[PDB]
Amino acid sequence: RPTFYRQELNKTIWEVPERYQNLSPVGSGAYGSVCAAFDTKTGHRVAVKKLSRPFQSIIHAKRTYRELRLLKHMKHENVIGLLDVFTPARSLEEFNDVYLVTHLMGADLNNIVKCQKLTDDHVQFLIYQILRGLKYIHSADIIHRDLKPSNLAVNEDCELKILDFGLARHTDDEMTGYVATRWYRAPEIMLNWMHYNQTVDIWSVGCIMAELLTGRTLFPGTDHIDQLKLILRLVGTPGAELLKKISSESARNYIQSLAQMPKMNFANVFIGANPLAVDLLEKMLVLDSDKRITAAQALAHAYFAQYHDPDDEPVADPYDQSFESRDLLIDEWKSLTYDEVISFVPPP
Ligand SMILES: CCS(=O)(=O)NCc1ccc2c(c1)OCO2
Numbered sequence: 001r002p003t004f005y006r007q008e009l010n011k012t013i014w015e016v017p018e019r020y021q022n023l024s025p026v027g028s029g030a031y032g033s034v035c036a037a038f039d040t041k042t043g044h045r046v047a048v049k050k051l052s053r054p055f056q057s058i059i060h061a062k063r064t065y066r067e068l069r070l071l072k073h074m075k076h077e078n079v080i081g082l083l084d085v086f087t088p089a090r091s092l093e094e095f096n097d098v099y100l101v102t103h104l105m106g107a108d109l110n111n112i113v114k115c116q117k118l119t120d121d122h123v124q125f126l127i128y129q130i131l132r133g134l135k136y137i138h139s140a141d142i143i144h145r146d147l148k149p150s151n152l153a154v155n156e157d158c159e160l161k162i163l164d165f166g167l168a169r170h171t172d173d174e175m176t177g178y179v180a181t182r183w184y185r186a187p188e189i190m191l192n193w194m195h196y197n198q199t200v201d202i203w204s205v206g207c208i209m210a211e212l213l214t215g216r217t218l219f220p221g222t223d224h225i226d227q228l229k230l231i232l233r234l235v236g237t238p239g240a241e242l243l244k245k246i247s248s249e250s251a252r253n254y255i256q257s258l259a260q261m262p263k264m265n266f267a268n269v270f271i272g273a274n275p276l277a278v279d280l281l282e283k284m285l286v287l288d289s290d291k292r293i294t295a296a297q298a299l300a301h302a303y304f305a306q307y308h309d310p311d312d313e314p315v316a317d318p319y320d321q322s323f324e325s326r327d328l329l330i331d332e333w334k335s336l337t338y339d340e341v342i343s344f345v346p347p348p
């Protein structure tokens with residue numbers, strides 16, 4: 001067991017191992033509080049997150065367990081991983097606080113698409129890395145659910161990591177109106193058309209790639225219905241085959257109320273873009289999620305010929321998510337989480 005020291009930072013007690021020095025507040029959401037620190041064991045600048053009220057309800061205790069299982073599993077160059085997890089508790093009986101440690105992220109994709117000139121070579125390398133990370137995530141039957149520029153960390157050498165997995169967190173208020181939180185979402189999940197799957201993340205990659213090529217948001221809708229009209233004007237209205245797959249009768253009735261529109265010519269929308277970029281966008285931005293290109297298929301597309309290496313695009317170890325259908329008490333979820341904290345083995 002390491003030695004811990006205590007300090008109060010912005011009205012919050014932090015109790016951490018001595019290896020973590022020079023802590024300074026960097027933000028606080030409803031998920032918890034975050035400090036920057038120097039890790040004397042590794043020599044890295046790190047983010048330390050102290051979870052807020054991790055075991056306050058069955059819902060919160062299960063969310064804490066889900067987040068810790070997912071972070072312990074992800075071991076890939078293009079995905080956020082766990083450097084450390086700790087509690088100051090010496091037994092299950094006194095266990096209340098959880099702290100997560102990751103590499104400290106600098107810029108996101110928002111702070112390079114807004115303020116930089118990107119070559120086609122930059123767009124190839126950035127989208128290649130997102131798809132390399134997604135092939136790995138999808139191989140474990142994990143859906144990200146919230147890919148957008150603020151969830152992509154990028155360094156001076158244009159190297160990218162995926163972070164901030166959707167842990168079923170987002171509220172109705174957060175998805176209402178003129179908001180970036182909804183602009184990257186697939187139409188089948190934005191309007192609850194059907195049981196969604198991993199294809200929703202490929203729609204999001206389409207919206208991100210378009211914005212890197214033009215410097216503008218592809219579908220900046222003022223509400224759910226405005227955004228659907230922007231989507232259908234580009235990709236066309238649905239045919240009978242997709243309409244049969246929409247499970248809501250009322251959603252089917254609303255779609256049928258709209259005048260029929262054909263798919264637009266994407267070379268006349270993405271003026272001057274690499275023809276291979278245009279071709280890949282037409283394969284991602286497909287309304288019927290059964291017919292979208294997969295991450296594994298997209299890595300083999302001629303747009304990425306410069307970067308593609310089929311011997312260096314790894315898949316994940318098997319991931320057991322059977323806990324998701326399990327009905328447990330607060331203290332049972334808390335005991336499972338305790339065991340995951342004490343069994344953690346740091347990376348090399
Ligand atoms: C695994 C679900 S997640 O990707 O949403 N976790 C977010 C997170 C945010 C800040 C952090 C952190 C973890 O550890 C230190 O600072």
Ligand SMILES: [Cl-]
Nearest residue numbers: 002017018019
């Ligand atoms: Cl220590």
Ligand SMILES: [Cl-]
Nearest residue numbers: 079080081103
């Ligand atoms: Cl990492």
Ligand SMILES: [Cl-]
Nearest residue numbers: 089095096097
């Ligand atoms: Cl504790």
Ligand SMILES: [Cl-]
Nearest residue numbers: 148149150180
């Ligand atoms: Cl964003």
Ligand SMILES: [Cl-]
Nearest residue numbers: 318319320321
């Ligand atoms: Cl597993």
Ligand SMILES: [Mg+2]
Nearest residue numbers: 150151163164
């Ligand atoms: Mg985020």
